[PDB]
Design an enzyme around this catalytic site. Structure first.
Site, PDB file in Angstrom:
ATOM      1  N   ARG A 224      44.277  35.494  37.378  1.00 26.64           N
ATOM      2  CA  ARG A 224      43.419  36.656  37.180  1.00 26.64           C
ATOM      3  C   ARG A 224      42.336  36.348  36.174  1.00 26.64           C
ATOM      4  O   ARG A 224      42.428  35.362  35.442  1.00 26.64           O
ATOM      5  CB  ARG A 224      44.227  37.879  36.690  1.00 26.64           C
TER       6      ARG A 224
ATOM      7  N   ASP B 104      49.646  41.944  32.842  1.00 35.94           N
ATOM      8  CA  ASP B 104      48.896  41.471  31.679  1.00 35.94           C
ATOM      9  C   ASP B 104      49.793  41.028  30.523  1.00 35.94           C
ATOM     10  O   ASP B 104      49.560  41.396  29.366  1.00 35.94           O
ATOM     11  CB  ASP B 104      47.959  42.560  31.144  1.00 35.94           C
TER      12      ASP B 104
ATOM     13  N   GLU C 162      35.792  47.148  29.002  1.00 36.98           N
ATOM     14  CA  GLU C 162      35.240  45.816  29.245  1.00 36.98           C
ATOM     15  C   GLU C 162      33.768  45.958  29.600  1.00 36.98           C
ATOM     16  O   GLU C 162      33.383  46.897  30.298  1.00 36.98           O
ATOM     17  CB  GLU C 162      35.965  45.168  30.420  1.00 36.98           C
TER      18      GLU C 162
ATOM     19  N   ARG D 267      32.252  49.103  31.718  1.00 39.69           N
ATOM     20  CA  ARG D 267      33.266  49.720  32.562  1.00 39.69           C
ATOM     21  C   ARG D 267      33.674  51.074  31.983  1.00 39.69           C
ATOM     22  O   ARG D 267      33.923  51.193  30.780  1.00 39.69           O
ATOM     23  CB  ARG D 267      34.491  48.802  32.628  1.00 39.69           C
TER      24      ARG D 267
END
Ligand SMILES: [Cl-]
Ligand SMILES: [Cl-]
Length: 470
Positions: free
Chosen positions: A27, A52, A327, A343
């Site tokens: 990712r 994550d 982000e 974002r």
């Protein structure tokens, strides 16, 4: 065709299984064109699953033919797992999310990325603050906590562990790791015997751990990405005492190319606070360096003193879901202004402007209903074509994380943005991505996509030209 076929740079496994290399997931792409013409593609190598956290290494691959073929994976950093963890899926100190950038004067290449000690990544942070650093006599040291004790031990010269009272012990931390992938970083020794690791937080075999907080690390390369320094902990240079999470907006940072701050390195980051954390405080900003990466400083948040429906907020105290910005991707205009595409949760593209090289932000965030934002990472780059100034921005077209798009905007003399084209680049699943100019009217993109049962995600590369854009 004006767009090349998909080349897979980091291949995930399929149907929930590991790939040929024992890795389930990749990712978080970053793409960097270096002064030598090389493409460096970075990613999270997520061994055990796609979430994550877990065993995640920072990796890159290099192409010396503009993306046609790619060399071997190079691991920048991969911290060793806690071999005693009850649940391996959350049993490793974690690195996640990188930003790449090259200094055009020194040619040094930086990868800046997040770090958490053992646990569920950001969700392993302590519910109450644990102080991570202490300044003693003008020097900042990372803190260690010892089982059963309240005081703050410190890691000083050569990794020597000092008592809270300030006496040296026979305990030592590996601060200058030497193993491949620097997997020995944080190892805790008593004399010559390896006892454990300061990043382990469960079933410990040594007495000491760091604060369960959020950290920012940096590694650099002076050989075009072939080899990398040991990680440097830049957290204390940039993380305020009120900040809970502080992490990068992954992708590729920039160096200002004009104006009084020409040469400044900009790295997108975002923070949360202790008031509303991930529910209402995610706030974009940049960190920067004016000394070719030696030292770093935090700029202000876009949300600092921002007026929202007649009332100011501050990144340190806000609790407002829709006022969040997370982000981001950063671009400098020829007029010197810095634009931060963030974002967020409005459904459309949010853009902040800084007139002082990224340090402070103008009162208003500009929204462009012409570009959807389904709440996912994006990337954008400056580009000149035939004497005219443009921005190219890529993200999911939607309605979900799907239908990757490359959006083209003309930069006006205002300098406002006029959206000209919205070009599909990848049908189906599409998430994080990173754009680069390749020269000769060409552009490259490294992006997350899956098909044919692939685990989230496979990171793929395509090249396109001006014809494709316009
Ligand atoms: Cl330990
Ligand atoms: Cl408000």
């Amino acid at each position: 065709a004006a767009l090349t076929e998909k080349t897979d740079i980091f291949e995930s496994g399929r149907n929930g299984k590991p790939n040929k290399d024992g890795i389930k997931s990749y990712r978080i792409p970053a793409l960097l064109k270096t002064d030598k013409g090389t493409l460096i593609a970075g990613a999270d190598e997520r061994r055990l699953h796609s979430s994550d956290w877990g065993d995640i290494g920072m990796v890159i691959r290099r192409s010396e033919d503009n993306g046609k073929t790619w060399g071997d994976r190079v691991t920048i950093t991969n911290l060793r797992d806690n071999p005693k963890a009850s649940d391996p899926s959350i049993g490793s100190p974690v690195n996640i999310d990188m930003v790449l950038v090259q200094d055009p004067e020194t040619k040094r290449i930086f990868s800046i990325y997040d770090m958490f000690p053992e646990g569920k990544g950001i969700f392993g942070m302590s519910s109450q603050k644990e102080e991570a650093y202490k300044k003693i006599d003008g020097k900042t040291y990372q803190i260690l906590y010892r089982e059963g004790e309240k005081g703050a031990y410190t890691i000083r010269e050569n990794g020597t562990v000092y008592t809270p009272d300030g006496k040296a012990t026979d305990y030592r931390v590996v601060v200058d790791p030497v193993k491949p992938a620097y997997s020995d970083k944080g190892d805790l020794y008593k004399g010559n015997q390896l006892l454990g690791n300061i990043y382990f937080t469960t079933n410990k075999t040594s007495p000491f751990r760091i604060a369960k907080d959020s950290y920012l690390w940096m590694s650099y390369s002076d050989d075009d990405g072939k080899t990398w320094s040991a990680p440097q902990d830049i957290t204390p240079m940039v993380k305020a005492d009120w900040m809970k999470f502080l992490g990068v907006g992954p992708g590729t940072g920039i160096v200002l190319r004009n104006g009084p701050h020409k040469g400044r390195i900009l790295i997108p980051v975002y923070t949360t606070n202790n008031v509303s954390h991930l529910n209402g405080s995610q706030s974009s900003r940049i960190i920067y360096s004016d000394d070719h990466g030696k030292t770093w400083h935090a700029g202000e948040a876009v949300n600092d003193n921002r007026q929202v429906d007649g009332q100011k907020i501050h990144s340190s105290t806000m609790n407002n879901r829709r006022a969040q910005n997370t982000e981001s991707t950063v671009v400098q205009l020829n007029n010197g202004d810095v634009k931060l595409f963030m974002r967020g949760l409005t459904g459309d593209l949010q853009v902040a402007t800084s007139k002082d090289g990224g340090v402070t932000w103008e009162k208003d965030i500009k929204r462009y209903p012409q570009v959807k934002d389904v709440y996912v990472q994006m990337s954008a780059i400056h580009t000149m074509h035939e004497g005219k100034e443009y921005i190219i921005l890529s993200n999911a077209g939607g309605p979900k994380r799907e239908n990757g798009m490359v959006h083209l905007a003309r930069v006006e003399e205002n300098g406002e943005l006029t959206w000209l084209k919205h070009n599909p680049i990848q049908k189906g699943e599409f998430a994080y991505n990173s754009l680069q100019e390749l020269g000769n009217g060409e552009y490259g993109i490294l992006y997350e996509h899956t098909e044919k049962g692939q685990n989230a995600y496979t990171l793929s590369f395509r090249k396109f030209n001006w014809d494709f854009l316009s």
